[PDB]
């Protein structure tokens, strides 16, 4: 739904002459789509939810989230000397909190 | 007038980690009191001669 095969055969100048079958193009399209996701950092697959114990770093507690939540959903912390859970609305674009 | 401590009351107990439920507890009363006194008020009479 994001990118149809007809756009491939029209941009890559293979509409008339195939030069490749369809399932190989399907494998190619998955390959090109599994490469940009991890190169740019921006998550993919419609949303995800990570449970992740955070480790303290620094005297004031610099905390980087390994998955950079969306823009403003309050991240919850608990356990490890933290008596009561509390929310935290993070940075959009960066994960340094 | 005197005073009577009705009870003492509890104070928030033994939380290892913050759950914020028993903050202030509940104390007791002091119950000011009062009280009066009473009296007898009796009499009697003889005339002059049956006593003499």
Chain B CA closest to residue A82: B17
A15, two tokens: 């509409």
Q: Determined by which method?
A: cryo-EM
Which chain A residues touch B18 with a CB distance below 8 Å?
83-84
Residues 6+ apart with CB under 8 A from B31: B3, B4, B5, B6
Q: Extract the tokens encoding B17.
A: 């980690």
- Count how many Cα atoms sit within 13 Å of the Cα of residue A8 in the half-sphere of its side chain: 18
Give the separation between CA A80 and CA B42, rounded to whole angstroms.
Answer: 83
| Pick among A78, A81, A83 to test the B interface (most B CBs inside 10 A) | A83
Residue B11, min C-alpha distance to chain A (Å): 20
Residues of chain B whose C-beta is under 8 A from some C-beta in A?
16-20
Residue B41, classed as helix, strand or coil, is coil
CA distances from B36 to A64, B19, B33 (A): 76, 51, 11
Residue A89 to residue B11: CA distance in whole angstroms: 35
Half-sphere exposure (Cβ direction) of A66: Cα atoms closer than 13 Å: 7
Q: Tell me the nearest-neighbour CA distance from A78 into chain B, angstroms.
A: 11
């Amino acid at each position: 739904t994001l990118l149809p095969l007809q756009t491939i055969r029209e941009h890559a100048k293979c509409d008339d002459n195939p030069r490749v079958t369809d399932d190989l193009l399907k494998l190619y399209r998955e390959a090109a789509f599994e490469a940009a996701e991890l190169y740019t950092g921006l998550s993919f697959t419609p949303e995800k939810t990570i449970v992740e114990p955070i480790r303290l770093k620094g005297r004031r507690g610099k905390i980087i989230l390994s998955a950079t939540p969306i823009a403003g959903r309050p991240v919850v912390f608990y356990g490890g000397g933290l008596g009561s859970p509390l929310e935290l609305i993070p940075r959009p674009g960066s994960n340094v909190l | 007038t005197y005073m009577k401590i009705a009870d003492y009351g509890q104070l928030g107990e033994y939380t290892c980690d913050a759950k914020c439920d028993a903050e202030f507890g509940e104390p007791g009363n002091i119950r000011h009191l009062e009280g009066k006194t009473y009296d007898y008020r009796g009499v009697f009479c003889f005339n002059r001669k049956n006593l003499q």
